[PDB]
Ligand binder design. Structure first.
Ligand SMILES: *CC(=O)/N=C/c1cccc(C)c1
Length: 225
């Protein structure tokens, strides 16, 4: 469990910030709203790895939701081709993601899903797929991302440098794009060391979330309501 941990009590993370007044205050407050947490490895891939695991875990046992998600995943090669990716170069990453979705369907256990996401090979193939799909979704909607995020940004250079490569950190744009690319509603809780309110953002703004993440010390951990 070196990439994604077993479930722990929320208050177990006090030990990560000993004798810290603001972090203790915010973690106590978080414990009033959430019951458990899983930690992720801080290797620069933790957003993709956390969102992929938590969303697929939320599908377990839900036969209609699995059928609809599989139908969307089967169309994602068309998003990659429209953005200029070549089939022979994405094949191994697409096949790894489709495999873990079939595991959710066929096996249906937390234990089997957690083993794939802790297998360095399978887990990194899944992360690389999710990074290629994020890049494709932004590229194919460049005018949207310029209109609503930043009129001045260079979209192709940003995807090349800050989305595709393994270990590159995320900002709001990658979070919004992968949410939209896979129709995943997620809520991010923010815990920093400023004397401010514990607060959160929902992607998309509308939505009822499937996934809750904690963003703290540049790391995304998984929360349970
Ligand atoms: C999500 C992820 O992998 N974060 C890695 C990280 C942690 C701590 C400090 C930095 C810059 C990164």
């Amino acid at each position: 469990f070196n990439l994604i941990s077993e479930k722990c009590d929320i208050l177990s993370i006090l030990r990560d910030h000993p004798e810290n007044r603001i972090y203790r205050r915010k973690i106590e407050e978080l414990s009033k709203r959430f019951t458990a947490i899983r930690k992720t490895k801080g290797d620069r891939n933790c957003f993709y790895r956390a969102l992929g695991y938590s969303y697929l875990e939320s599908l377990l046992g839900k036969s209609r939701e699995i059928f609809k998600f599989k139908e969307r995943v089967l169309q994602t090669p068309n998003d990659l081709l429209a953005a200029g990716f070549e089939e022979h170069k994405f094949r191994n990453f697409f096949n790894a993601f489709y495999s873990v979705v079939e595991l959710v369907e066929k096996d249906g256990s937390v234990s089997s899903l957690l083993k794939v996401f802790n297998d360095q090979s399978a887990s990194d193939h899944i992360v690389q797929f999710l990074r290629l799909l994020t890049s494709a979704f932004i590229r194919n909607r460049a005018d949207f991302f310029r209109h609503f995020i930043d009129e001045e940004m260079d979209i192709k250079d940003f995807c090349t440098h800050e989305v595709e490569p393994m270990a590159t950190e995320c900002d709001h744009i990658q979070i919004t794009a992968l949410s939209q690319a896979l129709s995943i509603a997620l809520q991010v809780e923010y815990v920093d060391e400023m004397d401010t309110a514990l607060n959160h953002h929902v992607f998309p703004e509308a939505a009822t979330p499937s996934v809750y993440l904690l963003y703290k010390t540049s790391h995304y951990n998984i929360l349970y309501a």
